[PDB]
Design a binder for these strands. Structure first.
Ligand SMILES: *[C@@H]1O[C@H](CO)[C@@H](O[C@@H]2O[C@H](CO)[C@@H](O[C@@H]3O[C@H](CO[C@H]4O[C@H](CO)[C@@H](O)[C@H](O)[C@@H]4O[C@@H]4O[C@H](CO)[C@@H](O[C@@H]5O[C@H](CO[C@]6(C(=O)O)C[C@H](O)[C@@H](NC(C)=O)[C@H]([C@H](O)[C@H](O)CO)O6)[C@H](O)[C@H](O)[C@H]5O)[C@H](O)[C@H]4NC(C)=O)[C@@H](O)[C@H](O)[C@@H]3O)[C@H](O)[C@H]2NC(C)=O)[C@H](O)[C@H]1NC(C)=O
Ligand code: 0G6
Ligand code: NA
Ligand code: NA
Lengths: 33, 258
DNA sequence: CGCCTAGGTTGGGTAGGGTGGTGGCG
C-alpha cells in the first residue's frame, strides 16, 4: 500500500505552502516555452 | 553534482540519502515517494560486476538532510528497510536498462518542513513536460569532479548540491555514446556551445530528476540519476531512468498489498 | 561579560543554527 502523502505530494512546506519561490524554479518554468 | 550550487534548506524535501551501516559511508541518492516507499537506482544496491549486492540489513535510509556528513539533530530522520524490490528486468550485464528499485521502510516516517514526498508523474504531465529543451532539476551529495583522476578542487560537497538541466533530443543522446540507449532512459544536460554546464556524477545515482508542473505547482520526478561517462564533459550527457515508462511496475509493487 | 571555537549517531556556521544543551578564555 502507498501509505500517506499522495494528496499533498510535490508541495514543499517551505515554499509552495508559503507562496515562496526558490531561487531558480523560475528558470525551469521559463524553459517550458 | 558537477557545476551545481548549494541547495536551499527544504528545497528538495524528498531527497534521501542511501547510507551504509558498516563501514559508515554514503552510497547513493534516493527519493521519498510516500511515508514508506523510497525510490532509487538498482545499481546502488546491486551491481555484480563490482561485487555489489546489498541486502536490507546492510543499509539504512536518511531523510531530511542537507549536510553531507553531519548528523542533523532534531531534523533528519533515519529509517531502516523492510524490503528491497529491484526491477526484475534490470539489466546490469549490459547498459543498466531499468535502473530502478523500490525500498519499503520498516515503519512509516512522519513528514515535516524538511521531509516531504515528491509526486510520481501521470501520462499528461509526462506528455507535456518530457520535451527537449525543457529543464528539470537534479540534486545530490555526489562528486564535484571526476575523482578517479588527479583534478583540482574538492571531491564532495559539504552540503546537498543542486543543478537545473535541460532534456536532450533522443537522437543527440544516442550519438553521444557507444553505450546502448533504451526507451527506459533519457539524457539531460547542456550542449557544448550552449553556454552553461552541469551534470550529475558518481554518488548522485538514485537521486531524483524533478520538474515543476506549471499546471498545478507540484513537483514531479521524471527521472532517476542512472549513469554517464565522465562528469560534465563536452558532448556527453547524463542519463536517467525514465520513471514514467516504469510507472506500471512501480505501481504494481506499491499497490500490491494493503 | 563578550568572545572562541566544540562533542555527540555531528561542524563550527555559533553556544544558534533549518535543532538541545551544552564549555573555556580574558
Ligand atoms: C545477492 O545476494 C543474495 C543474498 O543476500 C543472493 O541470494 C541468494 O542466491 C542464491 C543463489 O542464487 C540462492 O541459492 C538458492 O538457495 C535455495 C534455497 O532457498 C532458500 O535459501 C535460504 C536457506 O536455504 C533461505 O533463507 C531463502 O529464503 C530461500 O528460501 C526461499 O527464498 C525464495 C526467494 O526469495 C522465497 O520465494 C518467494 O516467496 C514469496 C512468498 O512465499 C511463501 C508464501 O507462500 O507466502 C513464503 C512462506 O513463508 C512459505 N511458507 C512456508 C510454510 O514455508 C511459502 C512456501 O515456502 C512455498 O512457497 C509454498 O509451498 O512461500 C513470493 O512468492 C516471492 O515471489 C518468492 O520470490 C521464499 O520466501 C523462500 N522459501 C522458503 C521455503 O524458504 C535453493 O533451493 C536454490 O537451489 C539456490 O541454490 C540463495 O537462496 C539466496 N540467498 C538468500 C539469503 O537469499 C543473490 O543470489 C545475490 N544476487 C545476485 C543477482 O547476485
Ligand atoms: C551509481 C551512480 O552514482 C553513477 C552515476 C553516474 C552519473 N554520471 C553522470 N555523468 N551523470 N552510476 C555509475 O557510475 C554507473 C554504474 C556502473 C558504471 N556507471 C557508469 O555510469 C559508467 N561510467 C558508464 C557505464 C558503464 C556500464 C553500464 C552503464 C554505464
Ligand atoms: Na556534457
Ligand atoms: Na551543536
Amino acid at each position: 500500500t502507498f501509505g500517506s502523502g499522495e494528496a499533498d505530494c510535490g508541495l514543499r512546506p517551505l515554499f509552495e505552502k508559503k507562496s515562496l519561490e526558490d531561487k531558480t524554479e523560475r528558470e525551469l518554468l521559463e524553459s517550458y516555452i | 553534482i558537477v557545476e551545481g550550487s548549494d541547495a536551499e534548506i527544504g528545497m528538495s524535501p524528498w531527497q534521501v540519502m542511501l547510507f551504509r551501516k558498516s563501514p559508515q559511508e554514503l552510497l547513493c541518492g534516493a527519493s521519498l515517494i510516500s511515508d514508506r516507499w523510497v525510490l532509487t537506482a538498482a545499481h546502488c544496491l546491486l551491481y555484480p560486476p563490482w561485487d555489489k549486492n546489498f541486502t536490507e540489513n546492510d543499509l539504512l535510509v536518511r531523510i531530511g538532510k542537507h549536510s553531507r556528513t553531519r548528523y542533523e539533530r532534531n531534523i533528519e530522520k533515519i529509517s531502516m528497510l523492510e524490503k528491497i524490490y529491484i526491477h526484475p528486468r534490470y539489466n546490469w550485464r549490459e547498459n543498466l536498462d531499468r535502473d530502478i528499485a523500490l525500498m519499503k521502510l520498516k515503519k512509516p516516517v512522519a513528514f515535516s518542513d524538511y521531509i516531504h514526498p515528491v509526486c510520481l508523474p501521470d501520462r499528461e504531465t509526462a506528455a507535456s513536460l518530457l520535451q527537449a529543451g525543457y529543464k528539470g532539476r537534479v540534486t545530490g551529495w555526489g562528486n564535484l569532479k571526476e575523482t578517479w583522476t588527479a583534478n583540482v578542487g574538492k571531491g564532495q560537497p559539504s552540503v546537498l548540491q543542486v543543478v537545473n538541466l535541460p532534456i536532450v533530443e533522443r537522437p543527440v543522446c544516442k550519438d553521444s555514446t557507444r553505450i546502448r540507449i533504451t526507451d527506459n532512459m533519457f539524457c539531460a544536460g547542456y550542449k557544448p556551445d550552449e553556454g552553461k554546464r552541469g551534470d550529475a556524477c558518481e554518488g548522485d545515482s538514485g537521486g531524483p530528476f524533478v520538474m515543476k508542473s506549471p499546471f498545478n505547482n507540484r513537483w514531479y520526478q521524471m527521472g532517476i540519476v542512472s549513469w554517464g561517462e565522465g562528469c560534465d564533459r563536452d558532448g556527453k550527457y547524463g542519463f536517467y531512468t525514465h520513471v514514467f515508462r516504469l510507472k506500471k511496475w512501480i505501481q504494481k509493487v506499491i499497490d500490491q498489498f494493503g
